[PDB]
Write a protein that binds this ligand. Structure first.
Ligand SMILES: Nc1ncnc2c1ncn2[C@@H]1O[C@H](COP(=O)(O)O)[C@@H](O)[C@H]1O
Ligand SMILES: Nc1ncnc2c1ncn2[C@@H]1O[C@H](COP(=O)(O)O)[C@@H](O)[C@H]1O
Ligand SMILES: N[C@@H](Cc1c[nH]c2ccccc12)C(=O)O
Ligand SMILES: N[C@@H](Cc1c[nH]c2ccccc12)C(=O)O
Lengths: 301, 297
């Protein structure tokens, strides 16, 4: 089976990145890494960090990520990551690092950690956007550079969101992508948003439902299963008011089961057990790579 | 006891640092790390590397380093090293790094790794020279910045070592890295090489001749005042012949033990026990670090 690696630091994420994973995970060997070591490249409150790792894990599970199916782990719990990362920072060039479009040295040297994340698992696909295209080009060069010197250890990874989905825009600025990092909470809808916020958020000159309206349609159709033409027919003479009233219900219906599970997980001692399994599985596959890598460089014995 | 940490990548060395430790290990908690991870910041042949790691260990044991006493281990075998290094590579500044007095990024980022090497063990002293003084001030700075943000978790380390020149250039310092193999005497140099190297205008033994006295004076236990006396009214030929014998006598039992360690499988066992011990101390420091930063659970 092919290998997929996703490193994770809104309904736009569910719909673009996170949704097709609940089933893709059945046809692929999937890894969902919570990159907490990448997160400290910037200022964190230890309490929020620790607590943000938890919710994320519980959310991926609440969404349908199956731990029997996929490997969901926390990056720092697999030391092979920081190990392979060091070896790769020894083969990478500063020039390469500074040329990175995107001060603590972590802001500069994190690219080799992201490459280690990927290369450790002999991954084939990396479900990332164009914003990470440069990071992938680089981990692909690093793999090639190492495979040529020491002989082939790595699969050269490819940048793909297999079965990718509609791009979700902001509710305040439909020319802007939906981002949880938005200063206006009204711009996005969070997977944990309560029925009432969703409604209010959805509620806030031409008047025709035909493909901001184009964003509400993309949201409506992916979430309801209907085609944009179905809905264009459905609302042929209808106003934005009832369309929105309808759309707010399909969003609440989607997030309800999700939110109900997120809470069971957050309360379950099974959450900690699922992450323990995932790091064991990962440490195993990763630990093996690290020693094949050292074997090749002449490290230790 | 106070903790001493030494990271290792001639007789100049032995006289300088390594020899005293044989006594010190009993009074201090000493760690002798073979920095194989630092070694890869520059081009290595995988075979020679793997090989040099082995002999360095055998040489240290052969010199008198007591494993029941100190901790001799290979850096790569303690993962906590690269983990702490990353955490410290996020608090260090690039500017800090770039002013580093000393291309592959390993050549710019290894300082945070060298500070972790030290900080992981709550080391009090680091027995290094002046060339590392910029390196130590930086690790004292990183520890400081960390404690003040998170709380008191590292002992601020001191750089103190509780000078032999080249034999071909007495204004230059002895260094294996000399293009000229006669500039130095290796610990493994045979008796013939030792003699030759030592044989190679005032003609008076008073303090390149001041260097020989210093080599002699300390491998012998005698003193310079007492050696000047001894060698009143003789010249360099005898002085040089007696001195080649104190050097052969010194290195001979070291070479015997070294060879025994090199084919003994107690070697791999001393190293296993060594990494095990390090992993224990370091691992705990690491989870204490992630605790302060909020990493994992
Ligand atoms: N508003 C959005 N619309 C579509 N895809 C998104 C949106 N927000 C995040 N993603 C995707 O979800 C994943 C999370 O990465 P990030 O871009 O940081 O959000 C990536 O693959 C993004 O491409
Ligand atoms: N030729 C030498 N003369 C005196 N001390 C030396 C000599 N070589 C090494 N040392 C000491 O032993 C160590 C090895 O030097 P280095 O490992 O390059 O920093 C240092 O701590 C020096 O202070
Ligand atoms: N760097 C990515 C997250 C990430 C870390 N490691 C990865 C490995 C593969 C894909 C993505 C990642 C981001 O900014 O969100
Ligand atoms: N960087 C040192 C060796 C070293 C690595 N880590 C260390 C920690 C403490 C003291 C020295 C070291 C050298 O150039 O030789």
């Amino acid at each position: 089976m092919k290998t997929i690696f996703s490193g994770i630091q809104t309904i736009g994420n569910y719909i673009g990145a996170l949704r097709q994973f609940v089933e893709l995970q059945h046809e692929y060997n999937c890894y969902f890494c919570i990159v907490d070591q990448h997160a400290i490249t910037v200022w964190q409150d230890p309490h929020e960090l620790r607590q943000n790792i938890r919710r994320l894990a519980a959310l991926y599970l609440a969404v349908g990520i199956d731990p029997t199916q996929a490997t969901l782990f926390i990056q720092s719990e697999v030391p092979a990551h920081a190990q392979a990362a060091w070896m790769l920072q020894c083969i990478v060039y500063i020039g390469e690092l500074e040329r990175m479009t995107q001060v603590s040295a972590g802001l500069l040297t994190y690219p080799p950690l992201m490459a280690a994340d990927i290369l450790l698992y002999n991954t084939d696909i990396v479900p990332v956007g164009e914003d990470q295209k440069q990071h992938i080009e680089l981990t692909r060069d690093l793999a090639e550079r190492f495979n040529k010197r020491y002989g082939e250890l790595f699969t050269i990874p490819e940048a793909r969101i297999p079965k990718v989905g509609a791009r979700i825009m902001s509710l305040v600025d439909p020319t802007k992508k939906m981002s949880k990092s938005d200063p206006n909470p009204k711009a996005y809808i969070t997977l944990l948003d309560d029925a009432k916020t969703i409604e209010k958020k959805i509620k806030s000159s031409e008047g025709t439902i035909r493909y901001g309206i184009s964003n509400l349609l993309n949201i409506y159709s992916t979430l309801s299963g209907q085609s944009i033409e179905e809905l264009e027919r459905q609302y042929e003479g209808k106003g934005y008011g009832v369309f929105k009233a309808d759309l707010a219900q399909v969003v609440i219906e989607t997030l309800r089961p999700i939110q109900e599970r997120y809470h069971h997980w957050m309360e379950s001692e099974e959450l900690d057990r699922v992450l323990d399994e995932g790091a064991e599985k990962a440490n195993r596959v990763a630990s093996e790579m690290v020693r094949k890598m050292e074997q090749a460089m002449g490290l230790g014995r």
